[PDB]
Amino acid sequence: KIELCMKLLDEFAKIIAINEKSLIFSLDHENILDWLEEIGVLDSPQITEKLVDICFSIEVWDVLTLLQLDGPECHYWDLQMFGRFWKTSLMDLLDEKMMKKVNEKMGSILKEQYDKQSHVAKATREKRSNGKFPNRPKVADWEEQLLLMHNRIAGHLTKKKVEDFADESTQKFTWLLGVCSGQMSYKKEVAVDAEKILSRLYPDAEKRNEVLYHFGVSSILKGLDRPLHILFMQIYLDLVQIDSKSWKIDDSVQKLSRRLGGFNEWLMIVDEEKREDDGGFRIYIVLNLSHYFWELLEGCKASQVVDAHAILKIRKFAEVLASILDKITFWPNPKLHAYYYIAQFLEPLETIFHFPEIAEQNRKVIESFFKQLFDKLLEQKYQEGLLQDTKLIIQKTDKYLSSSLNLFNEYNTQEPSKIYPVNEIFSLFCRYGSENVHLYCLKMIKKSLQTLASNILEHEHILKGEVCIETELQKRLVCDAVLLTEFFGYFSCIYAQVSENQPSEHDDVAKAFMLLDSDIHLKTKIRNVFEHRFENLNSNCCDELKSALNDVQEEFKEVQDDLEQILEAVDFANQKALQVTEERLAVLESFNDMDDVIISEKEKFIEPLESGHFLKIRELSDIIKLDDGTELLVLIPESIQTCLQLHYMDTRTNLIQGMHALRTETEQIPFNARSLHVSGNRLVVCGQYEFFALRFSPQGDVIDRAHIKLNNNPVVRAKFCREIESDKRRRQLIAVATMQYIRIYDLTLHETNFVEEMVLPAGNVEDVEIINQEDGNVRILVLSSSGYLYEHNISVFNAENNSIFLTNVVNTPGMDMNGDGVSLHYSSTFNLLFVSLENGAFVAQLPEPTGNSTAPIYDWKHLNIKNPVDAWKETSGIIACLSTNCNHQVNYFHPTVGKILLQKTSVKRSIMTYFLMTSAKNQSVYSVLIYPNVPTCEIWETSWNNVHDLWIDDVPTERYAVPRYERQPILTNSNKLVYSILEFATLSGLEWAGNMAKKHLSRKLNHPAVCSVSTRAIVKCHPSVDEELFKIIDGAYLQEWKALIDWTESEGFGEMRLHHVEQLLDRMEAVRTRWPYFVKSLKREFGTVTSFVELMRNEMKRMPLHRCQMMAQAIVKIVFGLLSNGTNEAEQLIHVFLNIFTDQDTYHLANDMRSAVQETISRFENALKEEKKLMVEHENMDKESVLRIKNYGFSPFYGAPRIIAKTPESMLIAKIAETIPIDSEENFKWLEQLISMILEKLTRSNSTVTWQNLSDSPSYNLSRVLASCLAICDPVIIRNHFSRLIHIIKYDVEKIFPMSEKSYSNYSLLRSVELLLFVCLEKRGDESKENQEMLDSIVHDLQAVGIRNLCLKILEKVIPHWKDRGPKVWLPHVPLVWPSTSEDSYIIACTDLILLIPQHLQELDRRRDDQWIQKLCQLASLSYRQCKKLLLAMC
């Protein structure tokens, strides 16, 4: 019968715990203790357990009643622990703010559960409840019975005096502890009885309160095992923080763990069941407490005075953490983000190691902790769980299919930012690990290297960038590569910590010959790729470490073939990434037939990035690119409409930081601006009736302006024309639309005159598109009001007001349905035309032109869109447009092979404006939306997981802080792996490292770090500096130069090629230390030096006109060096160097090269003037302290002198370049040849080439370079060459004036004479005897020849023309910052020369003709300052 009562009371407890009505309540259960007395089983000890179970169930029922919740939607233990959470003395210690917080949170979750429920029980609850929390709802009748019998239970709970409750491991003891402190349902009599029995159990009060507190926290902890958990976590942290203020300095770790709950026993439960399905609550608690104490510690670090209490707190928590460290390793869930929390373990170790005493007393624990931590990295289940994780996603782009192996998004805001932070874990190992940890790690790496390499090579076909990553097995590849990389890096770091050799000779060679790019930029500390610090290593026990390292090195001999194979695969991937021509051709050709094209809206290729606060017609903002990578944003302000806002932003180091730091400027505009358009580098502002045009400089400063004022016909649209780099004739065509007509303005012909005007027959314009064909003809398509599309093409260009009736109509889209036309767009990259009408949109491929009389046939495809769309923008492969009937949605188009990806996005706010932009790091496409309110801007980006960058013409770059800042390509994971392999090889096996480094030397296919380690490896391989080392290096450089031929325009990447040529030009300098070897390499590669100079000349033309100065300087420097050092092709080399000036394809560049020479000569002086001073200081010094280089290359032309101090690296250089006595004089025979052939070129040049500007003529530049060269020769040389030049002049006057072929040659020679006199003038300061003798000889020669008479004859013919006939159009290129005809300019130039010559003759001749003064005064009256100064000097 006893078992029957056990079952009855158990069923009673279960049924009440679920709040379910049963017939038992109708009985008089208040005297249930009477019932048991009827049978007589009240003496049964086994029934009291079920009685206290009944009491517990009634308690949780009471908690449910107070909560006003009802229903068994929460487990029994949750509510039970929530009951123990109440007004019990555990919350006598809590403060008001946390009380408000917890009340608010439980109210919010209760309200959420409430609105989760249906209506009927909602009405029942609302009727039942008289108030919200914490007021108890209304009291019914049956709860009174339940409570009354609950309190009456106390009668059976006598159970003798103390002996029943002496057993601590009983349920009745837990109940007794619960009633003693604060259980609400129990009345005060029961509470005082419970307090009395506890006093009998524990006479003292200290242990009483200790066990009460421990029970409370252990209950709050044990309740968190079987899923409001976040709130309970938070209040646990709050209770711990409160209690931490009462910890004594002499407390034991066991007592402190007791105060925290059952902490030591809670974390020591290592069982499979506990690990399975746990939410990692233990590590959450440990990390939260550790992070709070770490924030406290780091806050106390910066203070000036140490706070004893805070230090005591941190110390006690550190002791606890040290005691428990060896247990927390087991808990991280392999199927969760185990590695993230493994990395997050950094703070507890930091605060443990802040105190050296704790770390010293706990050494074995720390070592075992780190050993298991490392063992976790190679465990199979952990790796499989990480692979199966849904947050591990590998980036996939269009060029690099998956070869980049990128797994980190810097702009992802989710909690697991770094799912696989192996580097942070290894850095922690390096920072705090001891010697034994390093030994274990080295052994494990040695064992695992071969398997890791084989697993990598299993997926070589996917490391080569041929296919993408699909399955979860293939992701293993990434989990290998990173791991392998880190292993090697770790090895290298430990080597640098334990071995001290520093040979200093390889560094000496690399510094002397400047083979390293960073050293070149320094001479014209560094941070390594892997940086780990060691703080717990002892140097007295190094030897065994060395042994381990040696073992690892031997392992490298067994795995080198696989490493070479993966290096080959990665190089193949890098080379393949830059070949995009065929993909683009296929994409463009795929649109030829409209029968095989679809529109897909299933792919989301644009995703939001971030909303920030940085700053009808919606074309109010646009962007312009600058040369140095900075960006200029132009926009129309709202407050003032008579100004234009310009913002300079620097987003090549970070987008967010770059947009934060803005440079604001205001440009005043005459009128209010309605619309804004930008093409390339110029912009058009559309006002009410007039419009404005601006053109900017490459530095971002405004250069050119043009204000144009034009029934009713206001301005509708206006846009520039697409410019072509191939078109030398740069026409600034702009099309302006008005409701009746289209006008075309050409800012290179006339500002107030339009080339053409076309008026619509019976319609209204809505949009106009202008297209610049390659032939030169310009196509224009205009969208009428009815929807008709009219196409015209222009072939002849004249600034004549012509009017045309538009009568060419193409097959209109949507036959017999077309609404009112809305917009037109033309994508030049894809050769596509978008037409947006009222009823929908259409796309077509622009067909080849046929004529001005017929009409072409268009094939149209519907874009699966109906609403009208107006504002269009285009960037790298990406088209965007703004729908007009709605103020929230944007549409994005991306054409792929035979399809057009479409995405329609909507934003919750009304949009003001937007603009597209290609990232300054060249890795994604951004779209910035500008709003009026406080969140001023939002930024969207191309989706990270699948980036569509087929049409981006650069590789990702960054401004890395090597503060020094350098533009370097992004270091992918594959290249990091390659660099790690190479560095480990240079450390371990030198022959293999040298053999492999010779393959990775091209700078256009490899990261700078890879090239640097390859050069270091090659240097180390050759210990004796010979011709072979420089032969290898300069062969790589010269092949890089030679490869420029194949990199034509259709090959794609344009900006990368430009920066690549700049890099080559910067690297050219270092050759000056090995000149004979470089000459030999040049001869063996190109055959002849003239071929190399021809290649440089060919590359000069392709460069933009405002950047060609650097390579002109390079050509001048190399030619001068070759001539100075002596070559057997001097004649042909000078021949081509001069032919550059006068050739049909290069004469426009003459003005550049002259300036280049005028720089080089100056640099030459900066050499010579230096060397002379060294001759002085060395006069009273030992002869064995300086050296003179006899084969200096072009070192003087670079400003470096030929006299260098005697140092070991100088000895290295002199061993190669040879030396001569320091006091040796100079030789200028090469200059003699240069001048002689320049003079011959001037004389034999073909004349009668008319010019509008004489300062840009080739012959003027040749004369100027002759003068600059003669300014440094020996005085006897000047005398000889000037005397030779003088006698070539023919002084016949009728034979040289008007137009004769000899006339222009004579003019050129006379100009040369004037320039040489100008040069000779400044030498009057020199007081040398030879200088005076040469000056007097030249003056006497000029007097004897008698050119002043010739000046009179020329002036006598010049003046009559001045008496007879004598008294803002944009340039094709951006301007850097009377007369009427060719004859008039020729006469002006003749006057200038023929007046300048006698003035210089008079000035130089420091030892009154009537005709002279008469002609001078007369011509002065006709004209000016030259005449006045000439008469003034005559007087």
Author numbering: 657 to 883, 891 to 1187, 1306 to 1396, 1416 to 1510, 1520 to 1771, 1933 to 2337, 2349 to 2358, 2372 to 2401, ...
Sentences from the paper on this structure:
Among the >600 human ubiquitin ligases, UBR4 plays a particularly important PQC role, being an essential and conserved E3/E4 ligase found across eukaryotes. Aside from teaming up with various ubiquitin ligases, UBR4 activity is linked to two specific cofactors: calcium-binding protein calmodulin (CALM1) and KCMF1 (13, 16, 17, 20, 21). Our data show that the evolutionarily conserved UBR4 complex forms a megadalton E4 arena, in which inward-facing ZZ-DZB domains of KCMF1 act not as E3 ligases but as substrate receptors. The architecture of the E4 megacomplex is conserved across eukaryotes, but species-specific adaptations allow UBR4 to perform its precisely tuned quality-control function in diverse cellular environments.
To explore structural differences, we determined the cryo-EM structure of CeUBR4. Although the nematode E4 complex preserves the ring shape of the human enzyme, it displays notable adaptations, particularly in the dimerization interfaces that result in different topologies of the ring-shaped arena. Proteomic analysis of purified CeUBR4 pointed to a distinct substrate preference, with mitochondrial medium-chain acyl-CoA dehydrogenase (ACADM) showing stronger enrichment compared to SSBP1, which is preferred by the human UBR4 complex. In line with this finding, we observed well-defined extra density in the central arena of CeUBR4, closely resembling the elongated shape of an orphaned subunit from the tetrameric ACADM complex. The functional importance of the ring architecture is emphasized by its conserved shape and dimension in CeUBR4, despite pronounced differences in its helical scaffold and dimerization interfaces.
